[PDB]
């Protein structure tokens, strides 16, 4: 009857997701609920978040359809620099009976596999669900899985002895973000061309906008056309050596860190002096290896992937 635990990302049942830096998403810390929860003398969850994740908030803690209330049923200690980005959630031992009473008409999820596979949390199949809002920040390595887990310390014995045991997710969820490098050249890929300007767009043509975290991930001002401001469209520029890049775009959106690449596009709004503005957007893809060749082998970007050459035609 003792707790089994699991962690998900994006939505219940999902273990892998890809994000653009600064986009807020949820982790889900999950536990089965013991039938004898009323007896428990400790129920405390600790989550040390990787450096490349920024904690945002804790959502509504749910068991089946019902919500537990902050500072009434549990207490939160938030991630800070001082505690090495660590979240703690402490369920109040003196509320263990009250919480158990809330569970009365619910059918409880029992075993690990069912917890792992759950895509919903309902009265008919209930468990403890802790959504934690998070972003991937500028400290991420492009193409590198960022894992998360937690540990539950539970005391199931109502014996007045402080003797908790651990419960740990057997398998860990992860997120990832990517990038791309470019070089602007003439029509035969000979001369490098400075001063081209591009709007960064999603594949459907929606402009990608700055957020403060994404701004912090794109610190080389030579590659940015004008000022970067949160909420405004991303505009890139080729440097005097023809080069530019974009760092922190989603790929493998619903897959592991090796998963499906995502297409983005560039609208050339200004051509190098003497050259023509094209009608058609230039596409590129972001993948695990489109910025770093070997992201599993590093803790900071190498930026060694082969840039895409973008051609320009003469006036
Ligand atoms: Ca999971
Ligand atoms: Ca005990």
PDB file of N, CA, C and O in Angstrom, residues 152-202:
ATOM      1  N   UNK A 152      10.207  11.229  -2.676  1.00  0.00           N
ATOM      2  CA  UNK A 152       9.262  11.309  -1.581  1.00  0.00           C
ATOM      3  C   UNK A 152       9.838  10.591  -0.359  1.00  0.00           C
ATOM      4  O   UNK A 152      10.291   9.448  -0.477  1.00  0.00           O
ATOM      5  N   UNK A 153       9.809  11.264   0.783  1.00  0.00           N
ATOM      6  CA  UNK A 153      10.132  10.661   2.086  1.00  0.00           C
ATOM      7  C   UNK A 153       8.822  10.493   2.829  1.00  0.00           C
ATOM      8  O   UNK A 153       8.175  11.488   3.220  1.00  0.00           O
ATOM      9  N   UNK A 154       8.403   9.243   3.013  1.00  0.00           N
ATOM     10  CA  UNK A 154       7.108   8.985   3.655  1.00  0.00           C
ATOM     11  C   UNK A 154       7.261   8.144   4.910  1.00  0.00           C
ATOM     12  O   UNK A 154       8.098   7.249   4.953  1.00  0.00           O
ATOM     13  N   UNK A 155       6.460   8.454   5.933  1.00  0.00           N
ATOM     14  CA  UNK A 155       6.420   7.646   7.157  1.00  0.00           C
ATOM     15  C   UNK A 155       5.006   7.093   7.317  1.00  0.00           C
ATOM     16  O   UNK A 155       4.107   7.819   7.715  1.00  0.00           O
ATOM     17  N   UNK A 156       4.820   5.814   6.986  1.00  0.00           N
ATOM     18  CA  UNK A 156       3.507   5.150   7.030  1.00  0.00           C
ATOM     19  C   UNK A 156       3.144   4.555   8.391  1.00  0.00           C
ATOM     20  O   UNK A 156       2.027   4.110   8.582  1.00  0.00           O
ATOM     21  N   UNK A 157       4.082   4.544   9.325  1.00  0.00           N
ATOM     22  CA  UNK A 157       3.841   3.906  10.614  1.00  0.00           C
ATOM     23  C   UNK A 157       3.348   4.917  11.661  1.00  0.00           C
ATOM     24  O   UNK A 157       4.088   5.846  11.994  1.00  0.00           O
ATOM     25  N   UNK A 158       2.099   4.748  12.183  1.00  0.00           N
ATOM     26  CA  UNK A 158       1.602   5.655  13.237  1.00  0.00           C
ATOM     27  C   UNK A 158       2.104   5.248  14.639  1.00  0.00           C
ATOM     28  O   UNK A 158       1.314   5.033  15.576  1.00  0.00           O
ATOM     29  N   UNK A 159       3.422   5.151  14.768  1.00  0.00           N
ATOM     30  CA  UNK A 159       4.046   4.609  15.972  1.00  0.00           C
ATOM     31  C   UNK A 159       4.809   5.646  16.805  1.00  0.00           C
ATOM     32  O   UNK A 159       5.480   5.286  17.768  1.00  0.00           O
ATOM     33  N   UNK A 160       4.733   6.919  16.414  1.00  0.00           N
ATOM     34  CA  UNK A 160       5.391   8.007  17.152  1.00  0.00           C
ATOM     35  C   UNK A 160       6.915   7.928  17.047  1.00  0.00           C
ATOM     36  O   UNK A 160       7.634   8.514  17.863  1.00  0.00           O
ATOM     37  N   UNK A 161       7.395   7.204  16.040  1.00  0.00           N
ATOM     38  CA  UNK A 161       8.821   7.111  15.748  1.00  0.00           C
ATOM     39  C   UNK A 161       9.043   7.681  14.350  1.00  0.00           C
ATOM     40  O   UNK A 161       8.306   7.354  13.412  1.00  0.00           O
ATOM     41  N   UNK A 162      10.042   8.555  14.239  1.00  0.00           N
ATOM     42  CA  UNK A 162      10.370   9.236  12.994  1.00  0.00           C
ATOM     43  C   UNK A 162      11.216   8.319  12.103  1.00  0.00           C
ATOM     44  O   UNK A 162      12.439   8.413  12.085  1.00  0.00           O
ATOM     45  N   UNK A 163      10.545   7.447  11.358  1.00  0.00           N
ATOM     46  CA  UNK A 163      11.219   6.421  10.555  1.00  0.00           C
ATOM     47  C   UNK A 163      10.734   6.369   9.091  1.00  0.00           C
ATOM     48  O   UNK A 163      10.181   5.353   8.663  1.00  0.00           O
ATOM     49  N   UNK A 164      10.925   7.470   8.323  1.00  0.00           N
ATOM     50  CA  UNK A 164      10.462   7.491   6.919  1.00  0.00           C
ATOM     51  C   UNK A 164      11.274   6.588   5.999  1.00  0.00           C
ATOM     52  O   UNK A 164      12.389   6.181   6.348  1.00  0.00           O
ATOM     53  N   UNK A 165      10.703   6.292   4.830  1.00  0.00           N
ATOM     54  CA  UNK A 165      11.336   5.497   3.781  1.00  0.00           C
ATOM     55  C   UNK A 165      11.239   6.312   2.483  1.00  0.00           C
ATOM     56  O   UNK A 165      10.365   7.165   2.369  1.00  0.00           O
ATOM     57  N   UNK A 166      12.115   6.036   1.495  1.00  0.00           N
ATOM     58  CA  UNK A 166      12.018   6.726   0.208  1.00  0.00           C
ATOM     59  C   UNK A 166      11.085   6.066  -0.771  1.00  0.00           C
ATOM     60  O   UNK A 166      10.920   4.833  -0.742  1.00  0.00           O
ATOM     61  N   UNK A 167      10.518   6.887  -1.654  1.00  0.00           N
ATOM     62  CA  UNK A 167       9.914   6.433  -2.891  1.00  0.00           C
ATOM     63  C   UNK A 167      10.464   7.328  -4.011  1.00  0.00           C
ATOM     64  O   UNK A 167      10.561   8.541  -3.841  1.00  0.00           O
ATOM     65  N   UNK A 168      10.840   6.708  -5.129  1.00  0.00           N
ATOM     66  CA  UNK A 168      11.537   7.379  -6.258  1.00  0.00           C
ATOM     67  C   UNK A 168      10.960   6.942  -7.613  1.00  0.00           C
ATOM     68  O   UNK A 168      10.730   5.756  -7.800  1.00  0.00           O
ATOM     69  N   UNK A 169      10.727   7.889  -8.558  1.00  0.00           N
ATOM     70  CA  UNK A 169      10.347   7.493  -9.915  1.00  0.00           C
ATOM     71  C   UNK A 169      11.364   6.522 -10.501  1.00  0.00           C
ATOM     72  O   UNK A 169      12.560   6.817 -10.480  1.00  0.00           O
ATOM     73  N   UNK A 170      10.909   5.361 -10.982  1.00  0.00           N
ATOM     74  CA  UNK A 170      11.888   4.435 -11.588  1.00  0.00           C
ATOM     75  C   UNK A 170      12.511   5.015 -12.869  1.00  0.00           C
ATOM     76  O   UNK A 170      13.668   4.715 -13.185  1.00  0.00           O
ATOM     77  N   UNK A 171      11.734   5.824 -13.595  1.00  0.00           N
ATOM     78  CA  UNK A 171      12.156   6.414 -14.873  1.00  0.00           C
ATOM     79  C   UNK A 171      11.917   7.923 -14.817  1.00  0.00           C
ATOM     80  O   UNK A 171      10.926   8.362 -14.234  1.00  0.00           O
ATOM     81  N   UNK A 172      12.810   8.699 -15.433  1.00  0.00           N
ATOM     82  CA  UNK A 172      12.805  10.175 -15.351  1.00  0.00           C
ATOM     83  C   UNK A 172      12.394  10.827 -16.676  1.00  0.00           C
ATOM     84  O   UNK A 172      12.879  10.414 -17.745  1.00  0.00           O
ATOM     85  N   UNK A 173      11.522  11.853 -16.622  1.00  0.00           N
ATOM     86  CA  UNK A 173      11.185  12.636 -17.823  1.00  0.00           C
ATOM     87  C   UNK A 173      12.293  13.653 -18.149  1.00  0.00           C
ATOM     88  O   UNK A 173      13.150  13.920 -17.296  1.00  0.00           O
ATOM     89  N   UNK A 174      12.279  14.215 -19.354  1.00  0.00           N
ATOM     90  CA  UNK A 174      13.332  15.168 -19.779  1.00  0.00           C
ATOM     91  C   UNK A 174      12.800  16.159 -20.798  1.00  0.00           C
ATOM     92  O   UNK A 174      11.841  15.862 -21.525  1.00  0.00           O
ATOM     93  N   UNK A 175      13.416  17.332 -20.836  1.00  0.00           N
ATOM     94  CA  UNK A 175      13.140  18.329 -21.902  1.00  0.00           C
ATOM     95  C   UNK A 175      14.415  18.744 -22.648  1.00  0.00           C
ATOM     96  O   UNK A 175      15.540  18.507 -22.173  1.00  0.00           O
ATOM     97  N   UNK A 176      14.251  19.411 -23.795  1.00  0.00           N
ATOM     98  CA  UNK A 176      15.396  19.763 -24.639  1.00  0.00           C
ATOM     99  C   UNK A 176      15.054  20.990 -25.477  1.00  0.00           C
ATOM    100  O   UNK A 176      13.894  21.255 -25.770  1.00  0.00           O
ATOM    101  N   UNK A 177      16.085  21.735 -25.851  1.00  0.00           N
ATOM    102  CA  UNK A 177      15.922  22.874 -26.735  1.00  0.00           C
ATOM    103  C   UNK A 177      17.093  22.851 -27.717  1.00  0.00           C
ATOM    104  O   UNK A 177      18.128  22.245 -27.419  1.00  0.00           O
ATOM    105  N   UNK A 178      16.929  23.465 -28.889  1.00  0.00           N
ATOM    106  CA  UNK A 178      17.986  23.437 -29.918  1.00  0.00           C
ATOM    107  C   UNK A 178      18.361  24.784 -30.525  1.00  0.00           C
ATOM    108  O   UNK A 178      17.899  25.838 -30.080  1.00  0.00           O
ATOM    109  N   UNK A 179      19.208  24.752 -31.551  1.00  0.00           N
ATOM    110  CA  UNK A 179      19.580  25.996 -32.245  1.00  0.00           C
ATOM    111  C   UNK A 179      20.044  25.715 -33.660  1.00  0.00           C
ATOM    112  O   UNK A 179      20.061  24.554 -34.112  1.00  0.00           O
ATOM    113  N   UNK A 180      20.468  26.771 -34.350  1.00  0.00           N
ATOM    114  CA  UNK A 180      20.942  26.645 -35.718  1.00  0.00           C
ATOM    115  C   UNK A 180      21.960  27.746 -36.044  1.00  0.00           C
ATOM    116  O   UNK A 180      21.870  28.859 -35.519  1.00  0.00           O
ATOM    117  N   UNK A 181      22.914  27.419 -36.915  1.00  0.00           N
ATOM    118  CA  UNK A 181      23.934  28.373 -37.335  1.00  0.00           C
ATOM    119  C   UNK A 181      23.819  28.619 -38.834  1.00  0.00           C
ATOM    120  O   UNK A 181      23.425  27.709 -39.592  1.00  0.00           O
ATOM    121  N   UNK A 182      24.174  29.834 -39.259  1.00  0.00           N
ATOM    122  CA  UNK A 182      24.016  30.242 -40.665  1.00  0.00           C
ATOM    123  C   UNK A 182      25.232  30.997 -41.190  1.00  0.00           C
ATOM    124  O   UNK A 182      25.963  31.620 -40.413  1.00  0.00           O
ATOM    125  N   UNK A 183      25.430  30.950 -42.508  1.00  0.00           N
ATOM    126  CA  UNK A 183      26.371  31.870 -43.180  1.00  0.00           C
ATOM    127  C   UNK A 183      25.742  32.385 -44.484  1.00  0.00           C
ATOM    128  O   UNK A 183      25.303  31.604 -45.312  1.00  0.00           O
ATOM    129  N   UNK A 184      25.680  33.708 -44.623  1.00  0.00           N
ATOM    130  CA  UNK A 184      25.133  34.380 -45.809  1.00  0.00           C
ATOM    131  C   UNK A 184      26.236  34.603 -46.846  1.00  0.00           C
ATOM    132  O   UNK A 184      27.274  35.188 -46.544  1.00  0.00           O
ATOM    133  N   UNK A 185      25.988  34.139 -48.063  1.00  0.00           N
ATOM    134  CA  UNK A 185      26.957  34.209 -49.150  1.00  0.00           C
ATOM    135  C   UNK A 185      26.265  34.681 -50.434  1.00  0.00           C
ATOM    136  O   UNK A 185      25.035  34.877 -50.457  1.00  0.00           O
ATOM    137  N   UNK A 186      27.062  34.876 -51.486  1.00  0.00           N
ATOM    138  CA  UNK A 186      26.535  35.171 -52.827  1.00  0.00           C
ATOM    139  C   UNK A 186      25.928  33.931 -53.515  1.00  0.00           C
ATOM    140  O   UNK A 186      25.671  32.916 -52.864  1.00  0.00           O
ATOM    141  N   UNK A 187      25.704  34.003 -54.826  1.00  0.00           N
ATOM    142  CA  UNK A 187      24.934  32.953 -55.510  1.00  0.00           C
ATOM    143  C   UNK A 187      25.732  31.675 -55.741  1.00  0.00           C
ATOM    144  O   UNK A 187      25.154  30.611 -55.975  1.00  0.00           O
ATOM    145  N   UNK A 188      27.052  31.768 -55.690  1.00  0.00           N
ATOM    146  CA  UNK A 188      27.882  30.586 -55.901  1.00  0.00           C
ATOM    147  C   UNK A 188      28.547  30.131 -54.599  1.00  0.00           C
ATOM    148  O   UNK A 188      29.497  29.349 -54.615  1.00  0.00           O
ATOM    149  N   UNK A 189      28.047  30.636 -53.475  1.00  0.00           N
ATOM    150  CA  UNK A 189      28.613  30.325 -52.158  1.00  0.00           C
ATOM    151  C   UNK A 189      30.099  30.688 -52.053  1.00  0.00           C
ATOM    152  O   UNK A 189      30.868  30.004 -51.377  1.00  0.00           O
ATOM    153  N   UNK A 190      30.489  31.778 -52.723  1.00  0.00           N
ATOM    154  CA  UNK A 190      31.875  32.276 -52.702  1.00  0.00           C
ATOM    155  C   UNK A 190      32.072  33.409 -51.670  1.00  0.00           C
ATOM    156  O   UNK A 190      32.648  33.170 -50.606  1.00  0.00           O
ATOM    157  N   UNK A 191      31.581  34.615 -51.961  1.00  0.00           N
ATOM    158  CA  UNK A 191      31.758  35.762 -51.057  1.00  0.00           C
ATOM    159  C   UNK A 191      30.792  35.674 -49.884  1.00  0.00           C
ATOM    160  O   UNK A 191      29.620  35.360 -50.074  1.00  0.00           O
ATOM    161  N   UNK A 192      31.290  35.943 -48.680  1.00  0.00           N
ATOM    162  CA  UNK A 192      30.436  36.103 -47.493  1.00  0.00           C
ATOM    163  C   UNK A 192      29.866  37.526 -47.476  1.00  0.00           C
ATOM    164  O   UNK A 192      30.559  38.486 -47.847  1.00  0.00           O
ATOM    165  N   UNK A 193      28.606  37.655 -47.063  1.00  0.00           N
ATOM    166  CA  UNK A 193      27.871  38.914 -47.167  1.00  0.00           C
ATOM    167  C   UNK A 193      27.274  39.362 -45.837  1.00  0.00           C
ATOM    168  O   UNK A 193      26.393  38.681 -45.266  1.00  0.00           O
ATOM    169  N   UNK A 194      27.767  40.505 -45.352  1.00  0.00           N
ATOM    170  CA  UNK A 194      27.241  41.127 -44.145  1.00  0.00           C
ATOM    171  C   UNK A 194      25.992  41.951 -44.412  1.00  0.00           C
ATOM    172  O   UNK A 194      25.760  42.409 -45.542  1.00  0.00           O
ATOM    173  N   UNK A 195      25.173  42.121 -43.378  1.00  0.00           N
ATOM    174  CA  UNK A 195      24.076  43.077 -43.407  1.00  0.00           C
ATOM    175  C   UNK A 195      22.737  42.633 -43.972  1.00  0.00           C
ATOM    176  O   UNK A 195      21.846  43.462 -44.159  1.00  0.00           O
ATOM    177  N   UNK A 196      22.589  41.344 -44.266  1.00  0.00           N
ATOM    178  CA  UNK A 196      21.274  40.821 -44.609  1.00  0.00           C
ATOM    179  C   UNK A 196      20.447  40.793 -43.330  1.00  0.00           C
ATOM    180  O   UNK A 196      20.997  40.604 -42.249  1.00  0.00           O
ATOM    181  N   UNK A 197      19.143  41.010 -43.449  1.00  0.00           N
ATOM    182  CA  UNK A 197      18.252  40.967 -42.291  1.00  0.00           C
ATOM    183  C   UNK A 197      17.110  39.995 -42.524  1.00  0.00           C
ATOM    184  O   UNK A 197      16.595  39.917 -43.633  1.00  0.00           O
ATOM    185  N   UNK A 198      16.728  39.257 -41.477  1.00  0.00           N
ATOM    186  CA  UNK A 198      15.710  38.212 -41.585  1.00  0.00           C
ATOM    187  C   UNK A 198      14.714  38.251 -40.432  1.00  0.00           C
ATOM    188  O   UNK A 198      15.109  38.341 -39.273  1.00  0.00           O
ATOM    189  N   UNK A 199      13.428  38.119 -40.756  1.00  0.00           N
ATOM    190  CA  UNK A 199      12.406  37.822 -39.743  1.00  0.00           C
ATOM    191  C   UNK A 199      12.411  36.315 -39.434  1.00  0.00           C
ATOM    192  O   UNK A 199      12.301  35.505 -40.349  1.00  0.00           O
ATOM    193  N   UNK A 200      12.530  35.928 -38.165  1.00  0.00           N
ATOM    194  CA  UNK A 200      12.399  34.508 -37.808  1.00  0.00           C
ATOM    195  C   UNK A 200      10.928  34.124 -37.637  1.00  0.00           C
ATOM    196  O   UNK A 200      10.195  34.746 -36.847  1.00  0.00           O
ATOM    197  N   UNK A 201      10.511  33.086 -38.360  1.00  0.00           N
ATOM    198  CA  UNK A 201       9.116  32.655 -38.366  1.00  0.00           C
ATOM    199  C   UNK A 201       8.985  31.162 -38.076  1.00  0.00           C
ATOM    200  O   UNK A 201       9.881  30.389 -38.402  1.00  0.00           O
ATOM    201  N   UNK A 202       7.843  30.769 -37.508  1.00  0.00           N
ATOM    202  CA  UNK A 202       7.479  29.361 -37.412  1.00  0.00           C
ATOM    203  C   UNK A 202       7.190  28.856 -38.810  1.00  0.00           C
ATOM    204  O   UNK A 202       7.090  29.641 -39.763  1.00  0.00           O
TER     205      UNK A 202
END
